[PDB]
Amino acid sequence: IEPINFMATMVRRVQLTDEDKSLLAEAAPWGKEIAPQMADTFYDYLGRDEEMNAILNATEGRIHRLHQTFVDWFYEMFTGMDSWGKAYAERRWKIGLVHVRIGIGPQHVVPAMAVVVNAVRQKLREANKSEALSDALGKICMIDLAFIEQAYFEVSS
Numbered sequence: 001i002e003p004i005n006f007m008a009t010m011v012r013r014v015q016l017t018d019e020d021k022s023l024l025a026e027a028a029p030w031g032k033e034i035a036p037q038m039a040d041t042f043y044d045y046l047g048r049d050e051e052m053n054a055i056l057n058a059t060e061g062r063i064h065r066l067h068q069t070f071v072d073w074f075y076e077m078f079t080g081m082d083s084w085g086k087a088y089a090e091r092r093w094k095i096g097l098v099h100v101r102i103g104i105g106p107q108h109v110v111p112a113m114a115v116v117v118n119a120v121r122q123k124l125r126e127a128n129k130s131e132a133l134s135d136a137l138g139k140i141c142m143i144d145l146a147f148i149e150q151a152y153f154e155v156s157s
C-alpha cells in the first residue's frame, strides 16, 4: 500500500543488514558486468515454458525491452537506487503491478525468482565471490519477490 513502509517491513523481515547493503553496493560494478548474461539466461528459461512463452508474444520489439528491463532491475538490486529507499520501493511496487496486469501469477514468478537466484549463485561461485555477498543477494531477490507477490495479493483481492 505505502511502498516505503512495505520496504522497511521487508528489510526487517528478510534481515537485510547495513553490512549486506555495503556488500551489494560494493559488488554493483560486477552486477552491471553480469546483468546482460543473466537477462539472456532468464529470457531462454521463460522461452522454454509453453505457458510463459505464450505470455511473451505481444511484439518482437518486446525482446529488447524484456532484456533491458531485466538488466536495469538486476543492477538496481546491487545499487538499491536511493539506498533501498522510497524510489526503490516505488519501482519494485510498479514491477509488481506490471506482472499482475499481464495475468502472470505466483506459479510463474516464484519459480522464475528461484531460477534467477540459482543463476546468480552460479556466477558468484564462478567468480569466487564471498558467501556473505551470495546471502545478501538471496535476501534482496526475496524482498523483490515479496513486492511482486504482495502486488498480486493487493490487485487480486
Ligand code: HEM
Pocket (backbone or CB within 6 Å): 046, 052, 053, 055, 056, 058, 062, 065, 066, 069, 070, 073, 094, 095, 098, 099, 102, 104, 108, 109, 112, 113, 116
Ligand atoms: C523474478 C522474476 C521477474 C522479474 C524480476 C521481472 C522484471 C521485470 C521488469 C523490471 C519489467 C518491466 C516492468 C516495467 O515496465 O516497469 C518486467 C516486465 C515484463 N515482464 Fe517481467 N519479471 C519477472 C518475471 C516475469 C515472468 C515470469 C514473465 C513471464 C512471461 C514476465 C513477463 C514480463 C512482460 C511481458 C513484461 C512487460 C514487457 C513489455 O513492456 O513489453 N516477467 N518484468
